[PDB]
Amino acid sequence: MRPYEIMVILDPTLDERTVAPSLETFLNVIRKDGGTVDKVDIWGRRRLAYEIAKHAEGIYAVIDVKAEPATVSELDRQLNLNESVLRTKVLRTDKH
Amino acid sequence: ALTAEQKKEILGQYGLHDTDTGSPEAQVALLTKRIQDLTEHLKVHKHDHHSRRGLLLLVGRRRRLLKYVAQVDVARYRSLIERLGLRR
């Protein structure tokens, strides 16, 4: 169970009020998998440096998660399949 | 390489007493575990030649340690060979 930091960008079209529940049900895969803990932080509605997928603004979200490598890859795979997620990136907050 | 708990368990099992880590028995057991892990890894990454060189180095070191243990005392050599499932 290694600690991870996940940053996602959601298209600004959707309301910021539904972002928190939508991520919350997304992280249910990591939660029920292996007794894993998240700390979701949202600072959205920022214009991007360059245009992404025909979009200039984006909603930024930072997720801090402690889970197994297989679990996190599963969450990352699911997030990219969803169309409301423009981009995502997984970091290891360990020494790496 | 192995984690601290695997090393602790192997050393407790094969060690001559509860403190030794440099006995040929303990060294050979740890090398055998490392070599098995490396062989499993190389079964997937066939083209990882750099790690294969390290595998060869470990194999040579274990062979030398076994040579020493056989020359010192043959009974210990036989016991170690039978316990670790090695050929030579």
């Binding site: 940053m7 960008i9 991007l48 440096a49 360059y50 992404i52 930072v62 981009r87 990136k89 970091l91 | -």
Partner: protein, 65 residues
């Protein structure tokens, strides 16, 4: 010459999230500044370059505006 502001006892950690801390390390063209101009140590220079690249990858810094 100059000071590695990160080796000091107050050296802030280098992250790809804090944009301003990186913006101070790139030139007006968006290029990464050299080590001799900046003055930080080799490890911190590598950390800065990696953080800048990561920030660019998530559209926090322009790719050479």
């Amino acid at each position: 010459t100059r000071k590695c502001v990160f080796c000091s006892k107050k050296g802030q950690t280098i992250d790809y999230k804090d944009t301003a801390l990186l913006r101070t390390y790139i030139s007006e063209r968006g290029k990464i500044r050299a080590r001799r101009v900046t003055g930080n140590c080799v490890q911190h220079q590598r950390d800065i370059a990696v953080a800048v690249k990561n920030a660019r990858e998530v559209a926090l810094l322009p790719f050479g505006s």
